Design a protein around this ligand. Structure first.
Ligand SMILES: Nc1ncnc2c1ncn2[C@@H]1O[C@H](COP(=O)(O)OP(=O)(O)O)[C@@H](O)[C@H]1O
Ligand SMILES: Nc1ncnc2c1ncn2[C@@H]1O[C@H](COP(=O)(O)OP(=O)(O)O)[C@@H](O)[C@H]1O
Ligand SMILES: [Ca+2]
Ligand SMILES: [Ca+2]
Lengths: 372, 372, 54
């Protein structure tokens, strides 16, 4: 009778809805805006904190804060505000009669799970809850049981291999390189053409430029030579004050940081080498099914041409006698929520929620022994 | 056998001289004045424009323009006229047989730099030239190879960390808050006492008031409290007509914009926070030396008490077991030119010059491959 | 060697030996030249050398 809630809680966006639906209902950015200037007109409902899309609507006079930074909930009061907004204003449900499934990146500190369990059980008084891993839900929404999942959101890029439903925890890769860092790099390299963007409001403008105009080049040096030789790669964008900017080679220099992370000073490997070393740390017999099932998920995998670039780099890295297939659905930026909707709707799942009585008898540490 | 020219062409002043010397010869402000009233006297040796100190003396009948605005050269004919003035009239030097060294703030757009190459080679026809970063020359004048440089001039305030001669480009911070913004804020808050300063001639008068009477307070709140409760902090200044003004809490409120930049409505952080984030973005081992080698340069660091205040503010943010030393030599106003003179007169430097023939096959884009 | 430890912030560090097997022979030759010439300060032409292996 009761319908479980699925709330995919990413670093940049939050996707909330009911289990069983095909698409989430409440998709809105996880920001809290606070007023920065002097309020002179008395009345008219001047609130002290705006949460969600109205913070985007009034972002010119607000300082904007992300409570989740690289998968870490830093400011818990703002995250409680976002949870209150997504329960009472967006979905408009009573949380004390609905189970709630939550998502989390792996290799994340254990205080985060305990504090989410404490806030969801004590403040909102839910009857049951569960915390799941995002890549596992991506493989659930993919409809298969074997594959290696590369999930990259706004703050974290993780990589999990699963064979026949059994995960390999020693081969899970994590990398703090995602859309926030790509946005900051694009803010850095727009100053070469004279466009200055510094404030937190215009960071969203640079993010919109990144979403609309960036793509992954198949060969970087040839695309450098093509951009230097001609001007056919240039495109124009309209700022919301009416100014028109144009960008050339900055379209594909920005997602190249995912493949060459020495552009922002990190000495770590690119995502193709991260996927290759995740496959090579796995056992000898399961690599053949993992090369053919590179499941691709998350929001920063929506660049044009990223899948062909991953195909070229992994086929270069792997031995030539094998087939490498990369699975990129067109709905892959919602795959974590769709897998959460699939998982909460199974009849075989309904005994492994964390009930209120288990929390009362075991404290917040029940989430370590039950979830994962 | 020829000598190199060193020309620090900062946004407020031009400081030019020969390499190997210890002090610059031609120091004059980067202004171009044009007449704004009608000429009624026949003869008199009247000119269409004035430059440098000659524009400074006759400023009552002139409109003054700064060709450099926050580091970016806006008007190029005026900058060409200032370069012609500092070559032919100030230094008495024919520039076709002396190589020249120029300075530039980091994260500037590229299109200045090539043009800064182009009319150095096509107009003045120098045999060689080079463009350097100001903070690197500050470390050259300091005599050491490890440190983080806070260089704040008239238009650009930037932090650059260098460890063992290796710069870290991902940790360079730029902030467009410097002496002109402090001057405009001082013109804004001087209207509270009834003193109006609106024209561009009397902006120089307010700049002189800022140079003579302003200081950085150690703690802001008790300084405001003792400014309100007494009159010992007040000082008097004589205008060149004869009028005498008296200022009180405006002496320390105008440097406070460097530490509290919300006074002019800017969302960004202060210089202590900017230096702390620039240190914290660096690698984990090198932060031991970066706390102990804070180097200041530029005229905006000439306020009394800025070093003690910056030490107290960095000491609050850093952990208590780290030793923080700020180096503020009394000659650090001229330190960019001194490092330019040390670098140009150095023996292994004379193969990094961008000569005439390399510009001839490479176009103006030689400066990106060679300089920095 | 030790001067790579003192400057390890601005360096990437590589081990030529990985699980006992020498992988990068140029870096191993560099370490051998450093330990013969800069640490023991001897010429290898007049000293027999004993080596160890797993
Ligand atoms: N079409 C697109 N092209 C490029 N980047 C995108 C696109 N759509 C979303 N993104 C990026 O994905 C990031 C967040 O995606 P997502 O994983 O759905 O949210 P979260 O990280 O909150 O889970 C955003 O920072 C955004 O920049
Ligand atoms: N004694 C002083 N006290 C306070 N500020 C000063 C002093 N001398 C110069 N300044 C400020 O320094 C700014 C620029 O100085 P400087 O860095 O030498 O020139 P540039 O910015 O061209 O490199 C000027 O705007 C001036 O207001
Ligand atoms: Ca996500
Ligand atoms: Ca300067």
């Amino acid at each position: 009778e009761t319908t479980a809630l699925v709330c995919d809680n990413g670093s940049g966006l939050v996707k909330a809805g009911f289990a069983g639906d095909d698409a989430p209902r409440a998709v809105f950015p996880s920001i809290v805006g606070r007023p920065r200037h002097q309020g002179v007109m008395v009345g008219m409902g001047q609130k002290d904190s705006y949460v969600g899309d109205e913070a985007q609507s009034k972002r010119g006079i607000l300082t904007l804060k992300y409570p989740i930074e690289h998968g870490i909930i830093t400011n818990w009061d703002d995250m409680e505000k976002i949870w209150h907004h997504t329960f009472y204003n967006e979905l408009r449900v009573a949380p004390e009669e609905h189970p709630t499934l939550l998502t989390e990146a792996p290799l994340n500190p254990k205080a985060n799970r305990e504090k989410m369990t404490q806030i969801m059980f004590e403040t909102f008084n839910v009857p049951a809850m569960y915390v799941a891993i995002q890549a596992v839900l991506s493989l659930y929404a993919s409809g298969r049981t074997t594959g290696i999942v590369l999930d990259s959101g706004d703050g974290v890029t993780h990589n999990v291999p699963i064979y026949e439903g059994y995960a390999l925890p020693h081969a899970i890769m994590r990398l703090d390189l995602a859309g926030r860092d790509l946005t900051d790099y694009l803010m850095k390299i727009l100053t070469e053409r004279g466009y200055s963007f510094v404030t937190t409001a215009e960071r969203e403008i640079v993010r919109d430029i990144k979403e609309k105009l960036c793509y992954v080049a198949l060969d970087f040096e040839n695309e450098m030579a093509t951009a230097a030789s001609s001007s056919s790669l240039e495109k124009s964008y309209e700022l919301p004050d009416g100014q028109v900017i144009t960008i050339g080679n900055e379209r594909f220099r920005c997602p190249e940081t995912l493949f060459q992370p020495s552009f922002i000073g990190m000495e770590s490997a690119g995502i193709h080498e991260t996927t290759y070393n995740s496959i090579m740390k796995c056992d000898i017999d399961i690599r053949k099914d993992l090369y053919a099932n590179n499941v691709m998920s998350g929001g920063t995998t929506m660049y044009p041409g990223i899948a062909d670039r991953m195909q070229k780099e992994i086929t270069a890295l792997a031995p030539s006698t094998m087939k490498i297939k990369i699975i990129a659905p067109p709905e892959r930026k919602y795959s974590v929520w769709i897998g959460g909707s699939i998982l909460a709707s199974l009849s075989t799942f309904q005994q492994m929620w964390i009930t209120k009585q288990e929390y009362d008898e075991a404290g917040p540490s029940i989430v370590h022994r039950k979830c994962f």
